[PDB]
Amino acid sequence: GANKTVVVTTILESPYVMMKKNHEMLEGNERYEGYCVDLAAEIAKHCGFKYKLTIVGDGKYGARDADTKIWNGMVGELVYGKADIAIAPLTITLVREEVIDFSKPFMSLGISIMIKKGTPIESAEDLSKQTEIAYGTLDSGSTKEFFRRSKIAVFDKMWTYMRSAEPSVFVRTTAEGVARVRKSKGKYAYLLESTMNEYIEQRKPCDTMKVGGNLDSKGYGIATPKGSSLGNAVNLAVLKLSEQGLLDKLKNKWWYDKGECG
Amino acid sequence: GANKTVVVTTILESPYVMMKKNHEMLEGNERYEGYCVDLAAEIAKHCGFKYKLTIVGDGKYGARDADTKIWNGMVGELVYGKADIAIAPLTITLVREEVIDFSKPFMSLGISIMIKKGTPIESAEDLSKQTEIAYGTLDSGSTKEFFRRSKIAVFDKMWTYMRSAEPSVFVRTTAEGVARVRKSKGKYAYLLESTMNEYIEQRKPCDTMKVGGNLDSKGYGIATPKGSSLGNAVNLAVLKLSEQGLLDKLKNKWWYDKGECG
Numbered sequence: 001g002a003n004k005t006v007v008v009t010t011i012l013e014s015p016y017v018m019m020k021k022n023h024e025m026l027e028g029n030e031r032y033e034g035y036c037v038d039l040a041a042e043i044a045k046h047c048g049f050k051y052k053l054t055i056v057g058d059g060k061y062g063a064r065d066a067d068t069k070i071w072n073g074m075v076g077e078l079v080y081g082k083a084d085i086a087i088a089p090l091t092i093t094l095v096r097e098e099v100i101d102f103s104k105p106f107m108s109l110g111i112s113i114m115i116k117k118g119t120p121i122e123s124a125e126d127l128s129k130q131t132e133i134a135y136g137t138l139d140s141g142s143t144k145e146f147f148r149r150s151k152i153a154v155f156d157k158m159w160t161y162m163r164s165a166e167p168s169v170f171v172r173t174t175a176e177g178v179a180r181v182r183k184s185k186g187k188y189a190y191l192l193e194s195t196m197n198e199y200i201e202q203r204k205p206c207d208t209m210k211v212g213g214n215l216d217s218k219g220y221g222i223a224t225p226k227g228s229s230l231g232n233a234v235n236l237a238v239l240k241l242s243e244q245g246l247l248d249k250l251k252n253k254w255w256y257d258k259g260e261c262g
Numbered sequence: 263g264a265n266k267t268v269v270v271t272t273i274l275e276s277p278y279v280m281m282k283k284n285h286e287m288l289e290g291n292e293r294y295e296g297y298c299v300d301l302a303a304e305i306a307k308h309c310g311f312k313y314k315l316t317i318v319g320d321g322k323y324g325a326r327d328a329d330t331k332i333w334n335g336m337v338g339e340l341v342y343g344k345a346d347i348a349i350a351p352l353t354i355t356l357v358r359e360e361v362i363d364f365s366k367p368f369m370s371l372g373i374s375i376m377i378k379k380g381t382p383i384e385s386a387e388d389l390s391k392q393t394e395i396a397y398g399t400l401d402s403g404s405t406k407e408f409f410r411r412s413k414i415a416v417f418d419k420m421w422t423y424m425r426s427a428e429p430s431v432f433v434r435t436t437a438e439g440v441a442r443v444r445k446s447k448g449k450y451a452y453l454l455e456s457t458m459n460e461y462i463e464q465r466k467p468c469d470t471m472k473v474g475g476n477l478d479s480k481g482y483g484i485a486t487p488k489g490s491s492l493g494n495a496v497n498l499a500v501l502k503l504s505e506q507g508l509l510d511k512l513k514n515k516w517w518y519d520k521g522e523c524g
């Protein structure tokens with residue numbers, strides 16, 4: 001059958017996909033910039049398809065409801081046929097692999113801690129052993145699910161606190177979490193992926209930092225629906241771009257070449 | 263059809279697979295220890311198969327001859343039907359993906375520099391700009407192929423020197439390379455994967471070290487022949503073990519918990 005424009009789901013998450021300053025006078029894919037916008041263009045070229053970037057309707061990564069088994073976020077879009085591919089900082093997880101396919105990873109990450117500078121916290125164990133400083137994670141993402149299922153005493157203890165914390169310690173978007181750290185006088189710390197932590201650490205006002213080692217070792221993959229023709233070509237594209245140096249170049253472009261903190 | 267014992271190809275490469283001290287009085291899989299021996303046991307359990315570890319006959323990772331298109335090493339064993347799966351520090355590369363399947367990566371690495379302590383070399387550029395200190399790579403592996411195809415001025419310059427260097431700067435095994443660094447009075451440096459470099463840095467006599475940043479960002483994958491039933495189960499096994507913490511535990515076990523250099 002004839003080639004058709006591929007519907008790409010992605011998420012507004014800096015510096016992966018961001019609105020261009022002048023987006024109001026732009027159309028289509030041209031409205032957007034970032035690592036994943038650059039990566040989509042390269043994947044598309046190698047795979048030989050035309051594509052339309054579409055921001056995920058519900059603004060979520062993807063979680064399955066325990067009772068209903070319904071998926072939301074970008075994972076849901078793939079599962080229910082509203083997108084052909086997800087090119088986003090979407091973490092490869094076993095439960096997600098039940099319902100979608102992931103490419104080999106194009107970027108590594110692990111769960112990490114973001115503090116406001118000066119906060120007397122160096123580690124997850126530190127957080128777990130006190131109550132003065134609140135802490136949380138993003139809703140409907142892999143970090144929250146990590147804590148929910150972890151067996152580890154410290155993380156299990158963190159999860160027991162976070163799940164019942166009031167007011168809620170969970171946030172709707174990464175930017176909300178970062179804003180919360182910045183304005184809570186060191187009484188909130190944020191659990192988020194090292195990639196996003198390390199990005200924000202080099203953004204003005206330069207008042208946050210990453211502390212501790214990463215809690216785990218994971219990757220982002222390009223996701224396609226089960227049985228999609230596209231998966232094979234996508235996986236070869238990722239390997240090619242890795243070997244060409246493109247993944248390294250794009251990481252440096254969007255994290256460090258553009259860093260605002262000296 | 264009935265389950266059959268799975269023939270696993272692997273390679274004697276420390277600390278992935280090593281002979282046990284008392285191997286002469288042991289049989290079968292019990293002759294061996296290391297990261298990949300531990301990983302094979304876990305993969306097998308999750309995938310529900312019985313297996314036989316078999317050291318690759320020609321002692322090589324895998325390279326394709328330019329003229330004949332024949333494959334050697336573990337890749338060859340999979341290609342020609344002499345093994346069902348490779349569980350080894352086998353690097354995921356696009357050319358290898360032509361003829362075998364790789365799982366998602368279970369360990370990260372990049373090409374790095376090993377020096378004898380005291381050698382006035384901090385980087386690949388350093389090596390490229392002088393002739394007093396010789397340098398090389400392992401034959402029939404991904405590091406040599408990296409230099410052979412690289413476009414980068416420094417690496418292209420390194421490749422031009424290495425390919426014509428006399429006496430040969432290439433080595434038959436990693437241990438030969440390490441031994442060569444140790445006994446060449448700082449006049450040989452060795453290009454090898456960060457994983458193996460970082461292992462040897464914590465081995466007596468503690469006379470080597472890693473210098474510079476990694477030249478690339480790659481991973482090891484479990485490899486199966488094209489069309490193997492096993493690939494799907496293997497990929498889910500890797501994701502499960504990642505999420506359980508097993509990959510982190512085994513890395514720490516074989517690299518750092520056992521370090522000999524304080």
Ligand SMILES: Cc1cc2c(cc1S(=O)(=O)N1CCN(C)CC1)S(=O)(=O)N[C@@H](C1CCCC1)C2
Pocket residue numbers: 104105106107108109219220238239242247248251354367370479480481
């Ligand atoms: C540039 C890059 C390439 C690859 C990865 C991560 C990265 S990284 O952006 O996470 N990179 C930045 C520089 N170093 C910190 C290494 C990690 S990855 O480990 O997830 N996957 C690799 C290979 C792609 C096929 C599987 C392994 C490419």
Ligand SMILES: Cc1cc2c(cc1S(=O)(=O)N1CCN(C)CC1)S(=O)(=O)N[C@@H](C1CCCC1)C2
Pocket residue numbers: 092105108217218219366367368369370371481482500501504509510513
């Ligand atoms: C423990 C570990 C787990 C995984 C990787 C690497 C590693 S690591 O041994 O290379 N690890 C050691 C500790 N840190 C240095 C992070 C890297 S990986 O990036 O190659 N692959 C991940 C996920 C497995 C599915 C794809 C991503 C698991």
Ligand SMILES: N[C@@H](CCC(=O)O)C(=O)O
Pocket residue numbers: 061062089090091092138140141142143144191192193
């Ligand atoms: N990368 C995560 C979202 C961020 C997070 O959970 O910290 C995901 O795919 O769910």
Ligand SMILES: N[C@@H](CCC(=O)O)C(=O)O
Pocket residue numbers: 323324351352353354400402403404405406453454455
């Ligand atoms: N891991 C490499 C071997 C070691 C090297 O080339 O440095 C491979 O699969 O070829």
